[PDB]
Write a protein that binds this ligand. Structure first.
Ligand SMILES: [Mg+2]
Ligand SMILES: [Mg+2]
Ligand SMILES: [Mg+2]
Ligand SMILES: [Mg+2]
Ligand SMILES: [Mg+2]
Lengths: 143, 143, 143, 143
């Protein structure tokens, strides 16, 4: 319905196995538009900040450790119902529970190394996009 | 012989028609690694600076117009023989002579809108990479 | 007496007459901490996005033309009462009615070329800061 | 006479004591122009890359730690004889040895925490600027 934006991250597992293009392609094929993107290697601090709402959770240490083990691609995806449509083609967090032809089905090995991230809601998307991108970096389409 | 780095730009035609992933997946499949990437909307000054070598050429104005008409994706590709490897994946500058399975063959409408740019030599690749990317921004593979 | 963040811009006038340091020293003396900064040459699109609220005003053209005539310095100042504190240091918009020792009084040539910009409130500070800076780019103090 | 470019870093000590403006002022007072600047918090990798040349040396870890202890301001300074001229203003590497009126004599505690960095030579300034800045990111004066 309303055109929304969501944060994608191609996680270090998918980057190291050179699946960036294949994953971007799935998004584009579903009608999401890439309106920002950049490759970064997160520092400890950078990861902890992104995930600061899970700072006191037990899983934080290993999450942070994985997400800093190699470079990631961060991207803003734009489209009708983007938050959810993105989640649709990402599929379930567990690859074993993920539908066929989702990203988790096709590219994830495990729960921890599940290939990609999408924001879980419109409020999270707004915060997550602002964590990685100045609005000045987002590139609306003009052709 | 050696591992080289080269600059890729996805031009505004291919961005606008949501081919970023497909193009990227062609580089990755051929064994090139994406070690940096960002989307930008080039200003006139950004584009003239990049293309300064062609400043006295007939096509300069049209090139700068086209390259500033909407957002691009600039990337650093790394691999064995990457400069020329990337060039053969791209195919002929003119899409009418480009071999099948090349990016210009598959995604370019015309010589003017030819989907993507690749650095033409090692010396040129180093300047064009430096133009868009601080050395600190390129993300070597770890893991 | 709450810690806030606000946007500062050193305008192309003050940049071109090399008053960046002097200006920065005023803020630091008054207690504000510089937690993000960058020099940028704004494109017309960059400037039109920042000043979007004024897009229908007759002065928009002049404003955008001046804010893109040369490089600026964009910064995030943090401190107690940061928004209005920053404003008292800047002084009145018009230099002719700004109190001696304010930024406008000492560095502004005219109303149009009034040396610097400061956010006018908390809502606008948040919007302005986010326009130029990813949260990941802001550097909280660590010693 | 030859216009040169050199790298300035305001180190984590001078930042934390809010001396950035005071230091920039000295550069501009001396006729150097700030043509790029940013605040960053360097990670271990960022610093290891900058100081790669000294990596087998025995001060390397001590240097990497100090330079990651807090945020820094990295700048490109432009002017007549900028490398040597910048070096004169900084003063002797050891602030106990530094002439009065030099930023090391006036802001530096000790040889560990000497307040600012400067490129040593013209060949090294160019590598060091290229590490932190893309060519396109540096802002020549246009007004
Ligand atoms: Mg686990
Ligand atoms: Mg912009
Ligand atoms: Mg006027
Ligand atoms: Mg950060
Ligand atoms: Mg430029």
């Amino acid at each position: 319905m309303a055109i929304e934006r969501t944060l994608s991250i191609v996680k270090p597992d998918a980057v190291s196995k050179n699946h960036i293009g294949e994953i971007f392609a799935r998004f584009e094929k579903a009608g999401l538009k890439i309106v920002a993107t950049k490759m970064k290697h997160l520092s400890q601090a950078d990861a902890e900040g992104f995930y600061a709402e899970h700072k006191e959770r037990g899983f934080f240490g290993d999450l942070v450790a994985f997400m800093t083990s190699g470079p990631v691609v961060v991207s803003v995806l734009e489209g009708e119902n983007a938050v959810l449509a993105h989640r649709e083609i990402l599929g379930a967090t567990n690859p074993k529970e993920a539908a066929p032809g989702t990203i988790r089905a096709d590219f994830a090995v495990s729960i921890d190394e599940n290939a990609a991230h999408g924001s879980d809601s419109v409020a999270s998307a707004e915060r997550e996009i602002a964590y990685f991108f100045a609005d000045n970096e987002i590139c609306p389409r003009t052709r």
